[PDB]
Amino acid sequence: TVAYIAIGSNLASPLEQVNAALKALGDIPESHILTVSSFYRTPPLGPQDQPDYLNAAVALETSLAPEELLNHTQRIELQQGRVRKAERWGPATLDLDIMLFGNEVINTERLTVPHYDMKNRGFMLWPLFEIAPELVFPDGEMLRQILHTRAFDKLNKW
Ligand SMILES: [Cl-]
Ligand SMILES: [Cl-]
Ligand SMILES: [Mg+2]
């Protein structure tokens, strides 16, 4: 099954963090990285000069069950980042989100696929469209269509 995973970092050298996260993701059992997007740059909300976010998307072929994949992504986040409690409202060392898992729809306390609000987050959709321009969401909506009809500025590259 192809899982699409969102990667985000705005602390401790994001280029270093995304690269470590990619390596970790690549090591997950019964899984293989199919494709990686370019790295995008998402500035913060606010003028106060806060660190920009590096965002990416990964196509991960996997024979794992969705909750099994989640066990590894959470593990990776916990081992590589999640250093201070403030990161939940503020800058983060590493965020790993499972965006999509094949055409599955999943709503458990643990795991919600498609990811919460992802259709309204260009920092997710732009890199996903780079690697999967023909993608169709589980409800039948085309990703391309979503980007042609919602108010997303083009994200600049890192
Ligand atoms: Cl850099
Ligand atoms: Cl959907
Ligand atoms: Mg392997």
UniProtKB/Swiss-Prot annotation:
Functional pathway: Cofactor biosynthesis; tetrahydrofolate biosynthesis; 2-amino-4-hydroxy-6-hydroxymethyl-7,8-dihydropteridine diphosphate from 7,8-dihydroneopterin triphosphate: step 4/4
PROSITE patterns in the record: HPPK
Activity's thermal dependence: Thermostable. Retains 75% of its activity after heating 30 minutes at 96 degrees Celsius.
UniProt keyword Protein transport present: no
Paired cysteines (S-S): none
EC number(s) from the headed UniProt entry: 2.7.6.3
Catalyzed reaction equations: 6-hydroxymethyl-7,8-dihydropterin + ATP = (7,8-dihydropterin-6-yl)methyl diphosphate + AMP + H(+)
MF annotations from Gene Ontology: 2-amino-4-hydroxy-6-hydroxymethyldihydropteridine diphosphokinase activity; ATP binding; kinase activity; magnesium ion binding
CDD domains: HPPK (cd00483)
Keywords linked to the UniProt accession: ATP-binding, Folate biosynthesis, Kinase, Nucleotide-binding, Transferase
One of the protein's GO biological processes: folic acid biosynthetic process
InterPro entries on file: Hppk (IPR000550), Hppk_sf (IPR035907)
Protease listed as a keyword: no
Family in the record: Belongs to the HPPK family.
PANTHER family documented for this protein: 2-AMINO-4-HYDROXY-6-HYDROXYMETHYLDIHYDROPTERIDINE PYROPHOSPHOKINASE
Function (record text): Catalyzes the transfer of pyrophosphate from adenosine triphosphate (ATP) to 6-hydroxymethyl-7,8-dihydropterin, an enzymatic step in folate biosynthesis pathway.
Subunit text: Monomer.
Name of the protein in question: 2-amino-4-hydroxy-6-hydroxymethyldihydropteridine pyrophosphokinase
